[PDB]
Amino acid sequence: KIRTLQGRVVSDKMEKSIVVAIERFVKHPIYGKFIKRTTKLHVHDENNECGIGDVVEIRECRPLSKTKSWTLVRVVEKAV
Amino acid sequence: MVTIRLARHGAKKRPFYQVVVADSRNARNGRFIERVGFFNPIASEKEEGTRLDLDRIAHWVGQGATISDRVAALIKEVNKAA
Amino acid sequence: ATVNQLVRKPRARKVAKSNVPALEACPQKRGVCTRVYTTTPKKPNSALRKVCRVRLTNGFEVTSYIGGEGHNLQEHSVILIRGGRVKDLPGVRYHTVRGALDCSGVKDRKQARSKYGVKRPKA
Amino acid sequence: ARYLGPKLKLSRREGTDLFLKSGVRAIDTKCKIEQAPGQHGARKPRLSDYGVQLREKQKVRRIYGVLERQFRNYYKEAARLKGNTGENLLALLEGRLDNVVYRMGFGATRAEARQLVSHKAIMVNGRVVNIASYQVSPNDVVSIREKAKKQSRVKAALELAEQREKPTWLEVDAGKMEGTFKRKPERSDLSADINEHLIVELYSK
Amino acid sequence: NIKSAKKRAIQSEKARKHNASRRSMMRTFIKKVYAAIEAGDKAAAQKAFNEMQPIVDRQAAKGLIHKNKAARHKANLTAQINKLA
Amino acid sequence: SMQDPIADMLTRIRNGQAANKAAVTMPSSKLKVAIANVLKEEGFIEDFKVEGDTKPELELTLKYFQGKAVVESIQRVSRPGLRIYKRKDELPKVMAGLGIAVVSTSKGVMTDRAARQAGLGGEIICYVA
RNA sequence: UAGCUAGUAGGUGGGGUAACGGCUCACCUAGGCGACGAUCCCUAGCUGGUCUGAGAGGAUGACCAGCCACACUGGAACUGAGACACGGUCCAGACUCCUACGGGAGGCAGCAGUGGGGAAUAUUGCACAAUGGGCGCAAGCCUGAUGCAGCCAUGCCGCGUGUAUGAAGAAGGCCUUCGGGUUGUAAAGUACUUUCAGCGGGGAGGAAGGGAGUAAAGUUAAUACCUUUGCUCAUUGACGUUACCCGCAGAAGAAGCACCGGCUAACUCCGUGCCAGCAGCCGCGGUAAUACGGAGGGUGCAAGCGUUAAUCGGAAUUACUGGGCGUAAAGCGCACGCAGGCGGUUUGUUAAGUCAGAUGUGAAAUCCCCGGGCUCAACCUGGGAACUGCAUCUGAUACUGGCAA
């Protein structure tokens, strides 16, 4: 299959694009504590179906603008 | 061009050559794709002096690799067994 | 101490700077010895301690102790400063290498001879 | 790079016969052993803990004629080898070629054996070895060459080989003047009075 | 500097002149094309496109335009005429 | 508030051994009965008994060999502030094998010997020495 | 250093590139980044690794190897498969040089080498014999890559300065309670040995190829030519009076440096008298100083030995492993509370953390292990282990998390 990620929409307001925060949960190298850690990504969506506060899966593609090398596959869990 | 060639690694007045597969425009003792055998011109009169992986050499010559005069001489020395 | 508090702000021991700003941390430097002095020590000791004041080659003007019994330094006398504190004098941080550029070896010495710049007597 | 001095002085600071002048006569008789290692040698030392460890290391080096960087390298090799580091260290000191030439009775002392080894009078396995610290493997044959065979020294040395205890890990045979280092010496096969834990602890501080 | 770098200097000057001329003729033919598309002319621009096609393919083969660029031009211009016709 | 009931259990057993207490009661859970079954199995407690219906109460009958107490030192390793997950190679032995370390592995709550024999590591709960 | 950003963030369309892309332009939207530290400032080539450490870490990134960047300084492109080009072009600038005064020329951070700077760092060497590179069908030409040689104890490793005997316990030195003690089997005497250096002979190996004739096969119309394989014949070594071997003469050419109050192994006498001076810390020296200076004696290391600079250790004195906070430094004056951290108990599902296995990768060298070659060692080297990681797939579901009750 394809490698994909899941994350939540952190903001919405851009012209056929979105930005998604990813939560990786990584152990501290010295201290041995599992710490949450984000990764904000500029993600493309044609016809901008996902709004703010959603949860969306996301795959990597060719560059579509500056940063923006990521595009959604499936919007889940939109509940407001 | 990729070349199966020798690369000098022993001490002073005592060379040990390792036969590698390098992009030919690298340095001699520099970057190689894979090493594929060795050649000690002394070693002693014991057992080997030279072993050399003929399957990988045949693979690279199948790919288009060239072979220097020493490596050709060593393949002409270790023909199939001797 | 709580592991969260160290994730927020890690441990940090200070730098523990150098006693000898002979800059770059070079083993010796050379200087010009702007003047030559004798200086009285701190309280439990009493002597007159033979000490020069030196314009180094890196710009720093530092004062420097002169080891051994009797020297031949006078005011221009390019010397090779070494590094090493004399605790008994307030503010000398360096020594002069005896047996170096314009600093002769100690006259009539026989033991610990290498650290005073004196050659082996022929016998 | 080797000692070159008064030998019985070294044997007198340690308080113990270091076998440094084995030679012609019997037990010392002209050493003044125990009495005075220098001018204030009549004084008892009241030796420290560093002093007993140090003095044990010096006993062993002054026996086998090794200096400090070489000894220290033997300690590193004995440390990395599997087993008991004291026993490994004595096994490394006993495989030295000048020592094996001394044990076989070819030299009267270890310095005389070291000069036989040094002056190309000794072959191992039919090849001449010039080096005092060659490490003799088990099942080796070490012998004297045709030059420096039937020279007086070695004969006299074999004469005083019978006065000693005939080590178990050798084939001493003096007829042909050749020997076989058969196995590594067990710790229980040598000397019984050196305390190698003291030199392990000396280097491990 | 005194070498066979003098020969590469003079050859690279000569080839600079040759390539500049051929590159300039190629660019003028492409300007003919989408300068005919500036006005709403279908068959005039098709005539100009047929006039530029062999020279852009040819300068691709000669080695000074690196054929993907060749392709782009004709591709873009084809789009323009079927945006127009 | 109570945020580590396992360390609370081990606290009950340390302070029961330290006070020559005959038996120790506490609120019960699946993990505490799993650990308690490991402790009875390895011989550090005498018995356990879970009673109650709507509020279960685990009860550990403690052991005392001589006048001295059997559970010499029980420590909590994987606390909630910092959890400790060891592999089958990193999996420690306590008092050089004379003292078990209760590891929660995917197959269940085991000891260090039993889970190193089972070929799988996990979350190391407590050292019992 | 708390706000930064207007081609800025995104969209549509045109152009551009080998290729996606605000890469560029026109228009539209008003975004984007930021306390998980943006922006600004100081410093810095990065890594495999190296040093230290029991380890976790800490410092560092000389040689060797991978990647990047630069080529007097600032900018630009041209040629080309590849450069915005170290020994190419163009412009400008600073410096240096030539000039007929109109103008020209140059770029060692290639190898040697100079001047300067500095505590400090090397020859204006030999060869393309090997290995590699460029060109060439090849012969061969070029190669300051490379192989070697020169200088330097800069390091690591090896060997030597002899060995045995030798009491009149010589003389002389130093101490002495003047009995002696110690230097000291030390020296001398006597008997042996020749490593290495010195002198003279012998002499591997790095040499595989290449050239010239044949013979066979292939191809072909051809028993030519060419290719391949055998065979024969001369040859190809900078190092290099090589490594190594043998012979000669004679112990003959070959031992210093620091320290001796405690820490810290090793003690007395004499000179000096708060001086001269010593010192890493404690501190010695103001008349009998085991601490200063000398001597005798000893101790430690040894072709080295000390000092200085720098790093880690010791330092559990930044404590993750692995510390503390009533009085030693340390509990906010007290609360409320957002973000954050943590979260009782039962069942079901998931399987993100966690665990197990597999696959791909984690360059080679280095460290480690078992072997092999240099007389050994350092050194070189064969195979493994390791690279504690990351990604993907397959499972397990106890604990943690998500979801539902």
UniProtKB/TrEMBL annotation, chain C:
GO annotation, cellular component aspect: cytosolic small ribosomal subunit
Residue intervals passing through the bilayer: none
Modified residues (N6-acetyllysine): 107
GO molecular function per UniProt: rRNA binding; structural constituent of ribosome; tRNA binding
Entry superkingdom: Bacteria
Subunit field text: Part of the 30S ribosomal subunit. Contacts proteins S8 and S17. May interact with IF1 in the 30S initiation complex.
UniProt protein name: Small ribosomal subunit protein uS12
HAMAP family referenced in this protein's UniProt entry, alphabetically: Ribosomal_uS12_B (MF_00403_B)
UniProt keywords, alphabetically: Acetylation, Metal-binding, Ribonucleoprotein, Ribosomal protein, RNA-binding, rRNA-binding, tRNA-binding
Organism for this UniProt entry: Escherichia coli
Function: With S4 and S5 plays an important role in translational accuracy. Interacts with and stabilizes bases of the 16S rRNA that are involved in tRNA selection in the A site and with the mRNA backbone. Located at the interface of the 30S and 50S subunits, it traverses the body of the 30S subunit contacting proteins on the other side and probably holding the rRNA structure together. The combined cluster of proteins S8, S12 and S17 appears to hold together the shoulder and platform of the 30S subunit.
Listed GO biological process terms: ribosomal small subunit assembly; translation
Keyword Metal-binding: yes
Residues binding Mg(2+): 30
Family from the record: Belongs to the universal ribosomal protein uS12 family.
TrEMBL record, chain D:
Gene3D superfamilies reported in the protein's UniProt record: Ribosomal Protein S4 Delta 41, Chain A, domain 1, RNA-binding S4 domain
Keywords: Metal-binding, Ribonucleoprotein, Ribosomal protein, RNA-binding, rRNA-binding
GO cellular component terms listed in the entry, alphabetical order: small ribosomal subunit
Pfam families xref list: Ribosomal_S4, S4
GO molecular function, one term: structural constituent of ribosome
Record-listed Mg(2+) binding positions: 81, 85
Positions of the RNA-binding S4 domain: 95-159
SMART domains found in the cross-reference section: Ribosomal_S4 (SM01390), S4 (SM00363)
Gene Ontology biological process terms from the UniProt entry: ribosomal small subunit biogenesis; translation
Signal peptide: none
Domain Small ribosomal subunit protein uS4 N-terminal: start-end pairs: 2-94
Domain of life: Bacteria
Family indicated by similarity: Belongs to the universal ribosomal protein uS4 family.
Function: Also functions as a rho-dependent antiterminator of rRNA transcription, increasing the synthesis of rRNA under conditions of excess protein, allowing a more rapid return to homeostasis. Binds directly to RNA polymerase.
Assembly notes: Part of the 30S ribosomal subunit. Contacts protein S5. The interaction surface between S4 and S5 is involved in control of translational fidelity.
Designated name of the protein: Small ribosomal subunit protein uS4
Organism this protein belongs to: Escherichia coli
TrEMBL record, chain E:
Biological role: Binds directly to 16S ribosomal RNA.
A single BP term in Gene Ontology: ribosomal small subunit assembly
UniProt family annotation: Belongs to the bacterial ribosomal protein bS20 family.
Key word Repressor present: no
Keywords (A to Z) from UniProt: Ribonucleoprotein, Ribosomal protein, RNA-binding, rRNA-binding
Keyword check for Amino-acid biosynthesis: no
GO cellular component annotations of the record: cytosolic small ribosomal subunit
GO molecular function: small ribosomal subunit rRNA binding; structural constituent of ribosome
Protein name: Small ribosomal subunit protein bS20
Start and end residues of each stretch annotated as Disordered: 1-24
NCBIfam families: S20
Pfam families: Ribosomal_S20p
From TrEMBL, chain F:
MF term (GO), any: rRNA binding
GO cellular component: cytosolic small ribosomal subunit
UniProt GO BP: ribosomal small subunit assembly; translation
Statement: the UniProt record of this protein carries the keyword DNA repair: no
Keywords on record: Ribonucleoprotein, Ribosomal protein, RNA-binding, rRNA-binding
Stored HAMAP family: Ribosomal_uS8_B
Complex formation: Part of the 30S ribosomal subunit. Contacts proteins S5 and S12.
The protein's role, per its UniProt record: One of the primary rRNA binding proteins, it binds directly to 16S rRNA central domain where it helps coordinate assembly of the platform of the 30S subunit.
Family membership noted in the UniProt record: Belongs to the universal ribosomal protein uS8 family.
Protein name per UniProt: Small ribosomal subunit protein uS8
Natural source organism: Escherichia coli
Gene: rpsH
